[PDB]
Amino acid sequence: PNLNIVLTCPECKVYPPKIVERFSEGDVVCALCGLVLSDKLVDTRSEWRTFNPLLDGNNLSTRIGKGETTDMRFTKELNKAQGKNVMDKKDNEVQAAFAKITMLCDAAELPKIVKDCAKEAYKLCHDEKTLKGKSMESIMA
Amino acid sequence: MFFIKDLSLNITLHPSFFGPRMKQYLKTKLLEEVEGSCTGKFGYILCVLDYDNIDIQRGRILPTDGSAEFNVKYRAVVFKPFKGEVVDGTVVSCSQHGFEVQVGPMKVFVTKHLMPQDLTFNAGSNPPSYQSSEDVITIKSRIRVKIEGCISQVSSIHAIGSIKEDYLGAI
Amino acid sequence: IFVYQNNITPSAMKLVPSIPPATIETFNEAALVVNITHHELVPKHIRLSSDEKRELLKRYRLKESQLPRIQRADPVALYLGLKRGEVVKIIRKSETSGRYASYRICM
Amino acid sequence: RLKKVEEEENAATLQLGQEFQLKQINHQGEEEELIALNLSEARLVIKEALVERRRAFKRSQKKETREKELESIDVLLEQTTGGNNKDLKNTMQYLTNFSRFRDQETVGAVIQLLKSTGLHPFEVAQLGSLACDTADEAKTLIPSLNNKISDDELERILKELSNLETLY
Amino acid sequence: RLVKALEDIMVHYDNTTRNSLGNVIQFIYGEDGMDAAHIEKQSLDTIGGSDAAFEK
Amino acid sequence: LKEKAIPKDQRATTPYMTKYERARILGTRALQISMNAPVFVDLEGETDPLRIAMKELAEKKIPLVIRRYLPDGSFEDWSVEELIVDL
Amino acid sequence: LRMKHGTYDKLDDDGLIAPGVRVSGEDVIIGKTTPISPDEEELGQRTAYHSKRDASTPLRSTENGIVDQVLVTTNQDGLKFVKVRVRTTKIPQIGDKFASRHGQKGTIGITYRREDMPFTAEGIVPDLIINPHAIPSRMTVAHLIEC
Amino acid sequence: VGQQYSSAPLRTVKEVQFGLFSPEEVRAISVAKIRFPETMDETQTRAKIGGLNDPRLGSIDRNLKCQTCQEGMNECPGHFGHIDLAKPVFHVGFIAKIKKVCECVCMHCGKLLLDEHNELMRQALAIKDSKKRFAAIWTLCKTKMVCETDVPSEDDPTQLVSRGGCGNTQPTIRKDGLKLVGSWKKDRATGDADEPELRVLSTEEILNIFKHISVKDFTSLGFNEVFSRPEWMILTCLPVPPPPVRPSISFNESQRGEDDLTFKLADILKANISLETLEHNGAPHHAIEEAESLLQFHVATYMDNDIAGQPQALQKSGRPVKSIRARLKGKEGRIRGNLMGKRVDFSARTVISGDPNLELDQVGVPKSIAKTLTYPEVVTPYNIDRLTQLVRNGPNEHPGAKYVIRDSGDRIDLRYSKRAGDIQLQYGWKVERHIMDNDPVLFNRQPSLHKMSMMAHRVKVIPYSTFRLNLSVTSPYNADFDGDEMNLHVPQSEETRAELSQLCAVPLQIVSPQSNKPCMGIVQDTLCGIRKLTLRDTFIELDQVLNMLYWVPDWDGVI
Amino acid sequence: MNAPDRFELFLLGEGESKLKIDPDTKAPNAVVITFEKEDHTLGNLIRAELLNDRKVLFAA
Amino acid sequence: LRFGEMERDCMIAHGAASFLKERLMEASDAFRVHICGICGLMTVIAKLNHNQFECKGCDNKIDIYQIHIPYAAKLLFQELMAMNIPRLYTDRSRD
Amino acid sequence: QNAQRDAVTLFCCLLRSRLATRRVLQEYRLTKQAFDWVLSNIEAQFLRSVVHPGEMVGVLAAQSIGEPATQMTLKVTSGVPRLKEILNVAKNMKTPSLTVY
Amino acid sequence: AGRAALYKEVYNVIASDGSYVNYRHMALLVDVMTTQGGLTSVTRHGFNRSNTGALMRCSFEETVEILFEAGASAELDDCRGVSENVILGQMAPIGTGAFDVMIDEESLVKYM
Ligand SMILES: [Mg+2]
Ligand SMILES: [Zn+2]
Ligand SMILES: [Zn+2]
Ligand SMILES: [Zn+2]
Ligand SMILES: [Zn+2]
């Protein structure tokens, strides 16, 4: 099946077609022919200009604290009731080791690059019988 | 089977055809998009009745386009492919797992399971003949088929049938 | 027509809506010490027969609910004593044409 | 509105469909009974409509022998309309192949009889579109008819229809 | 708020001032059916003066 | 039900064609004249569809009729010839 | 892949532009390329067209200056980190907005040369003329006193 | 493009009808059976796992799929899927209504407390708009926390005639948190029975007892059985919306940064599977309560995050997750910012300056703006040559075209178009061309407050980019030239051009409808000059008067 | 873009004349003339001296 | 640019309804869909290469219409259904 | 018929006041011809002066009340807050005065 | 007398300065505010909680609550409102929309 679409001018057909993008018009044109192909393009840079999941894995990270439009006692209730699913995933250990290496790397005043590389190194193996414990110090170091 | 009823149609007309003589022009348009047509609600639409004193009399200009909309009321003849009774159709084409009977307009097919198992079908026939006593598939091939059900879809009509009954397949 | 000096105990007014079609109406003298209609902000009110009301509906092509309303507990409504489903023509002294007509429904 | 399933089969024990039921109302407000048709009656009325519209075009530019008739109405059809009506060619071939009477007068006499009998319209239209002379065999063909009609009355109508119609 | 509250009021061909549901707001529009523009502050010439001056 | 319409007599709506349908019929006639529909009065070299429609109204030949909706749903009709164009 | 039509000729072998050249509206100034891996970066889901997924930075679409004083130095942690600067001349035009020291903001309507600017006996042709009606309702006496 | 013509009958919307979904309705119309909380990158590349993100629903881009209905992207409207919950849960949009109706009906019998025998509620049933009847019923049935089998004696002379089903007693429900507790005082011990059953009412039993209500009870309570049922008013099977509602923003540096609603749905499905595994295996009956409370909490949060301030329920990072109420609230949440008003096309925006050489219906437009904007024309016999010439010009000098539109949905861009002199420009086509002169166009000043400030103008193209308008029209726009800015709006068809010119044009709006005197006039400079010129003590000689007379444009030629 | 510069301020008509001779239709023997690439510095002079001549009746 | 509420309002005050509609479609969304003639929902699967318009759940292949709508309104209906709520009936049924 | 008669009372009264016969003969000195002319002009203008059916009176009124509330100012309450109270009642007093004659 | 006093009051307020608006606008505001038998402030609830179209009523900032009420009561919206016709994108029956434009074969015949 593969569901895939390749653009092709239905009146030139001479190649995988030499077309261009008119980004200020949101249109694609067969540059050899001049007929528009498809219209109303979707943005590709303002979405980035508007503002790590791969290191944290498939499971989605959540920094949950306290807000402003609620009482302090209800924020304390939120902090007490938000800790009901810290044992189902192995991601609890993943961000536990991540917090530990965050402490260690930023204690060693290392760059963010080094921090992310250590995150990757732990994430790559992260669970094996070749790991076999080793007090977490061996594998983190 | 064929039916007669008063029926309504809504038709657009391009503004280029706003000439002084358009009533018979609309009658012509009614002719070639009523005659020879198929739907699901009324099936195959055969031909028109009541050619005179037809009911159009008024039309509205569409807002965004100069097309003028018209409503047409007319008597006509259609076909209603039923289910569950006998028709003596003719077969033109055949498949390996059953013949395709053309009872008038549509092409009803009978599956190789919908033919009786005691029918002595021989695959070495041109067309493959599912004959036991007399119902040999020919150019004529008058075969008494019962429509198990003419399944209705978008305007492309299809039906299913079988001959697992006495004098079904037999005339 | 019944006029009370002061308060009515509910036991002495629970059976006011008894004996249809006879209707009983209650009034305080304090509510009746001054005629309401003689106030100059209150326009003229008149009553509609059922026939001419039906004529009105057939002319202006309304259906019975698009008229502006008037409460049952309104003072002028209680003054006239009308009940549900009646229409009051209102003549008030307009300023762009002088005299102007309008209708209400007692719903 | 409630998605209104309403499963219904079409048969001759007054088991008729909603979409084409009996009592409709026509657009002027008068009641519209269902028009079911015979095969020979349809064979007549297609010719009636064809000659009527042909004479209508004769006035427009001014201001029963089946082997000739099928090809003649065919060339009349591609005089104005298109050649796409191959299935419509199949239909009047079916009509002239299996319609119980070739002539108009036998059909007219049968309908003149049925207007006095007052039978069920779809029932007798199915009977007329069928071309058989054997009432008990017809009852074995359609058990709906077998349950509905007595064989004696079925044959007492079938023979006085069968002597009139052109046998094949 | 005000323009939201008074949107759908329409003068109709029956010279009534109706809402969307056809509820009647004015019976004849504006108590006169007269437009928004073609109006001047011209003066009535019968109110004023004396009785004697008026009859003069 | 009861035909939801009116006879041409006792039409109780003003005979003065007003501005909104002025604009509407000018726009529509402009669009047909734009799409190569048959014009109904002679031309004098003018090519603007809107001005063509303006003159065509000026000597009153518009092949349109208008339908006014009373608030109930019943409707009158009028022929654009039988209106009067003063504003 | 899907790189723009910025006509990348103004760049050089080290992917930068040189100072002192001119740039029009759509000229790119910085060249960037995706180092991923894992994307089957030149062996899959793209032809060659090697590994671009180009992240180049074009100039703002309107202005057209001259590239001046480009520097590169590593960031806080050590990367390749680039700053360029472009310089433009902005002559006054019709719509530009000037103001006094008294809240008389306004813009240029049109311009004239001397030969139809009004002129005094010594030939001091004025720079600019503002309407008198901005005086009384604004009540800006000190402007006059300053003049 | 031709938008892929379909033979479905094009009609308009005339009526719209609300309601709720029955769970069988949503299960029937759903396509997918979303079960995997992970969405994307199964191995871990593309063609995502059969959980979220199109096994069989709305595709992402450039893939035809849309559950194999092939409308690329920009015609597939999305296709719904659904999930199944372990337990029924509430609806924050109906919490208070559930409380009111559970007050209203007797549980265990499932019938109304008051039944056509108190004359007061008889006439309360009689009166109806649609819901004041319901509120009257509710406030009449606050009391009598016991259900009865035979109350009515004074309906008859004294005969006590039985109608009721159960003699049970009702609690007094206390709304609290996201759940409902009862308190059956019930007063039927050997003593006073001072034992209120502080029992949290199960969603399951509320669902069952709501299933045990009559149709005529629905009509009394103001429910439409074919569209609105109280047992439909409890969530059991939950629809999901396709990715066109909640698109992965595709973060446009290297990543996706995939969005908020899908995060919340992943949470929902995670809590769902946690609850059902905890149930299916050993259930010690002290994780069940908080697990279902968390499930109901999270679906409540996804529905709304603007609730009574006991939770806040934020994600990463400290910005709280926006729910649908936050997406639809006032000030640009989907109604005041995308339906009632919106961005448009064919518009321009500059600053303005006066000009005493444009009459009122004219406006001066820079050549740049008139080169950017356009307006289609249909090719007639009348304009064939002019449009041919104007195409032949090309899109760079001003009186030229930009696009040609053929009879089918074609747009050949004139910019690339190396056969530009070779198009013969047949009839019935559309040529999309620059603003020529005296085209009608609309004109704006924010903030518009009254009937003016949308008035129309003819266009005279001028050089030296800025707008340009006559001084007299200044005060209706309420706009001095201190740096203000206007807006342009080019109409796109003949109807709209015509009605714009015949209504919104300036010269037929001199008299202000709001205050029955003209809103125009002449202003500062010409006013001062006209008083200066009209004085008895001044005079003009021959050469000056000749030049002035020639300055008057319609001057008949007599001195 | 197409905003004109100062080249067209005084360079005589490119593919064009220097002046047009168009007859008025509102008075006997009247002509309007359209000079271009010129302005007051010629127009005022021509008008004044032509008015100084006696046989003319109107010049502006 | 922006076409806000007040601009809409004063266009209403002019009464140029066709211009207002033109500005709300062509300058913006202008999306097409198909709606079920019985459900009144937008679930219609439209294989346009084959003119097939099955509406599962309704289970009909006949009563189908295409309409024209703002895309944002389409969206608003999508999440209104996601809130478990909007039948879109193509003609009158009250009179 | 009754509504039409009662809708033009002021206008016809003014018309009668202007075109009283003593007044027209003494002051204005018309002719028969100019008298017919002024009658036709009054009729034609008045018929041009009626409300065109089909336009948004409510929006017109709303804007015509809204905009001069913007340029309005701010013992007794007045101004913006009084307008807000009387447009938003809110049965609160702040000046519950009542004049007695 | 209530609406007369109210008109007197509003005229007093808006004519303390910046007079004058025409009478008919003010009268229309008074009448639409009093045409229910009782006074009805234009609030988030006052005129908003009438038996009026759900779409215009949710164009006024009580949006999800009033849509939930509409879904629960399952009521029908007539789409004779401008806001409904806008958000459904059809031309409202307004000004130029207030009628229809009908072809005439008869006059077309008569004008060859
Ligand atoms: Mg409503
Ligand atoms: Zn090409
Ligand atoms: Zn799809
Ligand atoms: Zn009970
Ligand atoms: Zn459906």
PDB file of C-alpha atoms in Angstrom, chain C residues 2-3 15 21-22 35 48 50 53 57 64 75 80-81 84 98:
ATOM      1  CA  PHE C   2     -63.174  41.820  48.016  1.00  0.00           C
ATOM      2  CA  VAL C   3     -61.346  44.509  49.977  1.00  0.00           C
ATOM      3  CA  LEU C  15     -60.101  28.685  48.575  1.00  0.00           C
ATOM      4  CA  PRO C  21     -66.341  30.217  36.529  1.00  0.00           C
ATOM      5  CA  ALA C  22     -66.868  32.669  39.363  1.00  0.00           C
ATOM      6  CA  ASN C  35     -56.205  55.799  41.209  1.00  0.00           C
ATOM      7  CA  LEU C  48     -59.975  43.636  23.156  1.00  0.00           C
ATOM      8  CA  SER C  50     -61.897  37.903  21.253  1.00  0.00           C
ATOM      9  CA  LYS C  53     -58.123  39.932  18.669  1.00  0.00           C
ATOM     10  CA  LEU C  57     -53.713  38.077  14.512  1.00  0.00           C
ATOM     11  CA  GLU C  64     -50.120  34.486  19.576  1.00  0.00           C
ATOM     12  CA  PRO C  75     -50.936  47.003  38.580  1.00  0.00           C
ATOM     13  CA  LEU C  80     -58.550  46.047  34.555  1.00  0.00           C
ATOM     14  CA  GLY C  81     -59.055  42.610  36.070  1.00  0.00           C
ATOM     15  CA  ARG C  84     -54.765  34.908  30.700  1.00  0.00           C
ATOM     16  CA  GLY C  98     -48.399  62.071  18.337  1.00  0.00           C
TER      17      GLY C  98
END
